[PDB]
Every structure is written in C-alpha cells, then in structure tokens.
Design an enzyme around this catalytic site. Structure first.
Site, mmCIF file in Angstrom:
data_model
loop_
_atom_site.group_PDB
_atom_site.id
_atom_site.type_symbol
_atom_site.label_atom_id
_atom_site.label_comp_id
_atom_site.label_asym_id
_atom_site.label_seq_id
_atom_site.Cartn_x
_atom_site.Cartn_y
_atom_site.Cartn_z
ATOM 1 N N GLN A 163 -14.994 -10.828 4.239
ATOM 2 C CA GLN A 163 -15.621 -9.519 4.161
ATOM 3 C C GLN A 163 -16.964 -9.525 3.440
ATOM 4 O O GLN A 163 -17.644 -8.498 3.397
ATOM 5 C CB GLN A 163 -14.680 -8.523 3.490
ATOM 6 C CG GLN A 163 -13.390 -8.271 4.240
ATOM 7 C CD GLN A 163 -12.481 -7.325 3.497
ATOM 8 O OE1 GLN A 163 -12.854 -6.179 3.198
ATOM 9 N NE2 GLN A 163 -11.270 -7.785 3.200
ATOM 10 N N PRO A 219 -9.930 -8.007 -3.674
ATOM 11 C CA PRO A 219 -10.044 -8.588 -2.338
ATOM 12 C C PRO A 219 -11.394 -8.277 -1.711
ATOM 13 O O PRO A 219 -12.166 -7.471 -2.241
ATOM 14 C CB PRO A 219 -8.958 -7.841 -1.567
ATOM 15 C CG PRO A 219 -9.052 -6.435 -2.153
ATOM 16 C CD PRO A 219 -9.395 -6.632 -3.625
ATOM 17 N N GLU A 248 10.063 10.512 -3.328
ATOM 18 C CA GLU A 248 11.421 10.075 -2.995
ATOM 19 C C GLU A 248 11.411 8.827 -2.132
ATOM 20 O O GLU A 248 12.190 7.904 -2.340
ATOM 21 C CB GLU A 248 12.204 11.202 -2.295
ATOM 22 C CG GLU A 248 13.643 10.868 -1.953
ATOM 23 C CD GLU A 248 14.557 10.913 -3.164
ATOM 24 O OE1 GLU A 248 14.045 10.853 -4.305
ATOM 25 O OE2 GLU A 248 15.789 11.005 -2.974
ATOM 26 N N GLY A 293 -17.732 -10.659 0.104
ATOM 27 C CA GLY A 293 -17.791 -10.703 -1.347
ATOM 28 C C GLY A 293 -17.937 -12.120 -1.880
ATOM 29 O O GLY A 293 -17.423 -13.072 -1.297
ATOM 30 N N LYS A 308 0.832 -1.220 0.000
ATOM 31 C CA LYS A 308 0.000 0.000 0.000
ATOM 32 C C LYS A 308 0.862 1.265 0.000
ATOM 33 O O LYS A 308 0.651 2.173 0.813
ATOM 34 C CB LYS A 308 -0.939 0.034 1.221
ATOM 35 C CG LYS A 308 -1.837 -1.166 1.390
ATOM 36 C CD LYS A 308 -2.921 -1.203 0.346
ATOM 37 C CE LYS A 308 -4.031 -2.163 0.765
ATOM 38 N NZ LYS A 308 -3.486 -3.529 1.025
ATOM 39 N N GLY A 352 -8.027 -14.329 1.674
ATOM 40 C CA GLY A 352 -7.170 -14.557 2.828
ATOM 41 C C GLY A 352 -7.783 -15.508 3.843
ATOM 42 O O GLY A 352 -7.642 -16.729 3.730
ATOM 43 N N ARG A 353 -8.476 -14.945 4.828
ATOM 44 C CA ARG A 353 -9.002 -15.698 5.974
ATOM 45 C C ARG A 353 -9.858 -16.914 5.642
ATOM 46 O O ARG A 353 -9.736 -17.941 6.311
ATOM 47 C CB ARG A 353 -9.773 -14.777 6.919
ATOM 48 C CG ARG A 353 -8.878 -13.859 7.736
ATOM 49 C CD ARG A 353 -9.670 -12.753 8.402
ATOM 50 N NE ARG A 353 -10.066 -11.742 7.420
ATOM 51 C CZ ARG A 353 -10.892 -10.728 7.655
ATOM 52 N NH1 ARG A 353 -11.443 -10.575 8.854
ATOM 53 N NH2 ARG A 353 -11.178 -9.869 6.688
ATOM 54 N N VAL A 410 -13.309 -11.014 -0.678
ATOM 55 C CA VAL A 410 -14.045 -12.241 -0.953
ATOM 56 C C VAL A 410 -14.013 -13.156 0.267
ATOM 57 O O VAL A 410 -12.946 -13.421 0.827
ATOM 58 C CB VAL A 410 -13.446 -12.990 -2.161
ATOM 59 C CG1 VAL A 410 -14.196 -14.301 -2.411
ATOM 60 C CG2 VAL A 410 -13.457 -12.107 -3.397
HETATM 61 O O1 LIG Z 1 -9.468 -2.962 -0.470
HETATM 62 C C1 LIG Z 1 -8.711 -3.817 -0.033
HETATM 63 C C2 LIG Z 1 -7.377 -3.903 -0.456
HETATM 64 C C3 LIG Z 1 -6.611 -4.904 0.067
HETATM 65 O O2 LIG Z 1 -5.338 -5.066 -0.307
HETATM 66 N N1 LIG Z 1 -7.125 -5.771 1.000
HETATM 67 C C4 LIG Z 1 -6.238 -6.826 1.502
HETATM 68 O O3 LIG Z 1 -6.719 -8.085 0.974
HETATM 69 C C5 LIG Z 1 -6.696 -9.113 1.994
HETATM 70 C C6 LIG Z 1 -8.136 -9.485 2.381
HETATM 71 O O4 LIG Z 1 -7.987 -10.663 3.175
HETATM 72 P P1 LIG Z 1 -9.340 -11.394 3.678
HETATM 73 O O5 LIG Z 1 -9.808 -12.390 2.528
HETATM 74 O O6 LIG Z 1 -8.780 -12.171 4.946
HETATM 75 O O7 LIG Z 1 -10.407 -10.400 4.001
HETATM 76 C C7 LIG Z 1 -5.907 -8.508 3.172
HETATM 77 O O8 LIG Z 1 -4.494 -8.741 2.985
HETATM 78 C C8 LIG Z 1 -6.184 -6.998 3.035
HETATM 79 O O9 LIG Z 1 -5.103 -6.258 3.624
HETATM 80 C C9 LIG Z 1 -8.413 -5.673 1.377
HETATM 81 O O10 LIG Z 1 -8.897 -6.474 2.172
HETATM 82 N N2 LIG Z 1 -9.184 -4.696 0.860
#
Ligand SMILES: O=c1cc(O)n([C@@H]2O[C@H](COP(=O)(O)O)[C@@H](O)[C@H]2O)c(=O)[nH]1
Ligand SMILES: O=c1cc(O)n([C@@H]2O[C@H](COP(=O)(O)O)[C@@H](O)[C@H]2O)c(=O)[nH]1
Lengths: 218, 219
Positions: B178, B173, B71, B180, B65, B195-196, B175
């Site tokens: 969160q 991300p 610089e 999705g 990120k 991720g999780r 999915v």
């Molecule tokens: O908008 C965004 C951008 C991301 O990089 N991420 C990243 O994507 C991953 C989501 O993981 P998870 O499936 O456990 O929610 C995490 O590494 C988070 O930092 C996100 O969740 N939302």
C-alpha cells in the site's frame, strides 16, 4: 428478493444442534435466514450449505464487512464459495471498500446489502451522523439492498426516502432491542428478528405471534 | 505490552491452508506474531488458529474488525478467544458500547483488544478519517491499551500516537504493497504489519529479512 412473511430469522445461536433444531421449528414461517459470525465462528462455514440442504432457505451472511478493498474482495469470495446468497457490508469504510464487494457479488451472482445506520445506542456516536451520506453513496454506487434500524423509525423512514421505493430494505432491532414489527414494516420490506424467536420458550409460537401481529401487512 | 519479535507482524491473508502454513513456516525465524484475518479463517476454519499455534511459536492476533451491536460483539469475541487467539481487533466507529462489549469479554477471558482508529486505504478519507481522533480519545477513555493506525498517512499516525500516549501499544498496516515505509512507520508504531510484500514474494524469508535489515537500527 421475496422474503416469506416479511420475516428474516437472525440465527445467532452458537451451537449447530440448537441452531438447526430451532430453525427447523420455525421453517414453516420463514424462507430467509441471516447467519452471522456467532454461528459461523462456532461451527464453521459448512453450516451454510447445511442450512441450504435442510431447509432450502436463502442465506444472508451478516459479516459486517469492514476492511480495505483487497481484503473485502477475499472475504466476499470465501463467503459466496460457502453458498451464501448475499453478504452485508459496512459503508463507513468508504466507497472503494463497498465497490470491492459489489464486484465479487456480480461475479458470483449474489447480492450486497449496505448497512447504513445501526440499531444500538452507540450508533449515535459516529454512524448516525454519516448515515444519510452512506445511503447516498449506496445510491451512487448502484446498491439496491440496505439495512437500517428498527429502533429509530424516523431514521428508517429517512433511509427509505433516500434509497427510494425500488430499493430493498431490511431492518433489525425488532423485539429484544425494542423495535415494533408493524411500525418497522411501514418502511422496511422485511424485519430481522433474532432473540425474540430463538430464545423464546416456544420459537414456533413466537414466530407465529409476530406474524399474526403483522397479518394485515402481508 | 506484547513483545513482538523484530517489530514485524505478518498479515497472513493467503486463503489456502497449505500455502499459508508454508509461508508462515518460512518466516518463522523472523516473526513471532501473526495476524490472521477472515480471508484465511473463512476459507479454512477457526481451527487454523489451533494449527498455527501447534506448528509455530507465534502469538495470534485475530483481525476480525469486530463491528456489530454489543450483544453480537460479545459472542464474536467469546468464540474467537475460545479458539485460541491472543488478541482481537475491533472497530470503534460503531461506538463506545460496542467497544466496551469486547473489552469486557477480553477482561473476563484474559485476552487483549486492539482498537482500529483510522484505516489505511483511500476510502478511509470519506467517513473514518473525520471520526478517527475522537475514536482514539474514546479508546483512551475506555482504557483501551492497544491500537491500529495507518502507515499510509504518517501525519495521521503521528497524531494518533499523540492521543494514545507513549505507553499505549500501536501497530500499523499499509507497509509495502500500500506504499507505507517500514522505517518511517516505526517512528510512531511499536510494530508494522506486512502482508503481500512478504507472502507474495518469490522468497518470503528473504523479503522479511530485507525489511528487517532496513530497520535494524530501530530494534
Ligand atoms: O487500516 C488497515 C487496517 C488493517 O487491518 N489492514 C489489514 O492489514 C493487512 C495489510 O496487508 P498488506 O501488507 O498485504 O497490504 C491486511 O490484512 C488488511 O486487511 C489494512 O490493510 N489497513
Ligand atoms: O444495526 C444492526 C445491524 C444488525 O445486523 N444487527 C443484527 O441483527 C440481529 C438482531 O438480533 P436480535 O433480534 O436478537 O436483537 C443480530 O444478529 C445483530 O447482529 C443488529 O442488531 N443491528
């Protein structure tokens, strides 16, 4: 936070030997070092404990934290585990992301700094228009530590107005980016200085010089 | 564009080297692209990128990120590519100069930049959402080819796909944990980031395989 000489060294050299030597050269002038990703990604998080062992300085981890709450929490935990006293976090990603950092800082006895407006020209595109609102968000959340731009004293003054005199404000963009040390300290509690010191032929004399120029403000 | 196996990218955000390696190894047959972020890097060092490359046949996307002045952005990108990352993820909200700094290093070093446009979490609604279309357009103007957009807001993901065009590469991300949906997200994204839902599962391989079965017709 009590910053010696109102001067925070931005240690962005990327090798351990140089970073340690240069910091040692200016140690008599500072007791607060900002360590960021340039040094940490080059030399590892163990560098934070090394600075504490060698200098006893306070360490502000300038990691511009800017992720979702769940990831922000992990980043803060890893950062404080490494011995950082404080972490810098972006406000643009919103209140939940900032609160995630505040929670970990409270748990580990550390401080969160909120970046409100950045110092570089690109800050004008998106950040500047959101900056006052980000500052108010910090106030609402109970944030007490802020970062704002030496390169725009009028914006820095506005940020100070919003957060009040009780809040702590530090400011980068001094020297290399054009900001003036004394003008910046009209509004900020402390200035952040990187290249003007660490790229100088004589870092100690550079730091001494900056301090001389603000002596009436100390 | 990178050829992401099964359109599925593992977000490896475990903070313990042993667990991160175990889980990644267990899903290796399903996933050849791993997103490594600061939770793992700050816990185990940049050499974790080296270890993943050694142990697995996986591309590495460094999700850092990047959000500093030009610089400092340059330095972060140099150190990251030096460590072996195939690509790095950068924020667009700090503006065009900060993005260009990353693109220039990536060009010089033969690697890739992903631009984050709108984020998936509720707080993204406060400031990021309102800037996201312009950030995407800025990306297009700068020649950015790879983008990140939110699975949690299909309508926004759809609009971002429109702005960047069909030729651009889009990963998403949000999915699973969160909320999705894999299939719905792949209507617009080239690949989903998970991720999780995978790394916290009792059987990460079964979790990955189950996601893949659900999107089989889209492969
Ligand atoms: O908008 C965004 C951008 C991301 O990089 N991420 C990243 O994507 C991953 C989501 O993981 P998870 O499936 O456990 O929610 C995490 O590494 C988070 O930092 C996100 O969740 N939302
Ligand atoms: O708005 C900001 C916020 C920062 O943290 N910084 C940081 O402060 C330091 C400024 O260093 P320098 O004095 O060399 O310009 C760098 O570490 C940079 O990443 C900045 O320059 N502008």
């Amino acid at each position: 936070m009590d910053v010696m000489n109102r001067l925070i060294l931005a240690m962005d050299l990327m090798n351990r030997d140089d970073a340690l030597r240069v910091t040692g050269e200016v140690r008599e002038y500072i007791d607060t070092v900002k360590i960021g990703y340039p040094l940490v990604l080059s030399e590892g998080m163990d560098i934070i404990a090394e600075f504490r062992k060698r200098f006893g300085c306070r360490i502000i981890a300038d990691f511009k934290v800017a992720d979702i709450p769940e990831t922000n929490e992990k980043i803060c935990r890893a950062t404080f585990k490494a011995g950082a006293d404080a972490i810098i976090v972006h406000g643009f990603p919103g209140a939940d992301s900032v609160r995630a950092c505040l929670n970990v800082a409270e748990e580990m006895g550390r401080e969160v700094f909120l970046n409100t407006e950045m110092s570089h020209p690109g800050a004008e595109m998106f950040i500047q228009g959101a900056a006052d609102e980000i500052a108010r968000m910090g106030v609402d959340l109970g944030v007490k530590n802020y970062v704002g731009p030496s390169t725009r004293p009028e914006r820095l003054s506005r940020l100070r107005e919003i957060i009040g005199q009780d809040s702590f404000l530090i400011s980068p963009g001094v020297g290399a980016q054009g900001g003036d040390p004394g003008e910046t300290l009209r509004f900020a509690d402390a200035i952040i200085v990187g290249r003007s010191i660490y790229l100088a032929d004589n870092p100690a004399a550079a730091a001494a010089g900056i301090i001389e120029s603000i002596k009436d403000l100390l």
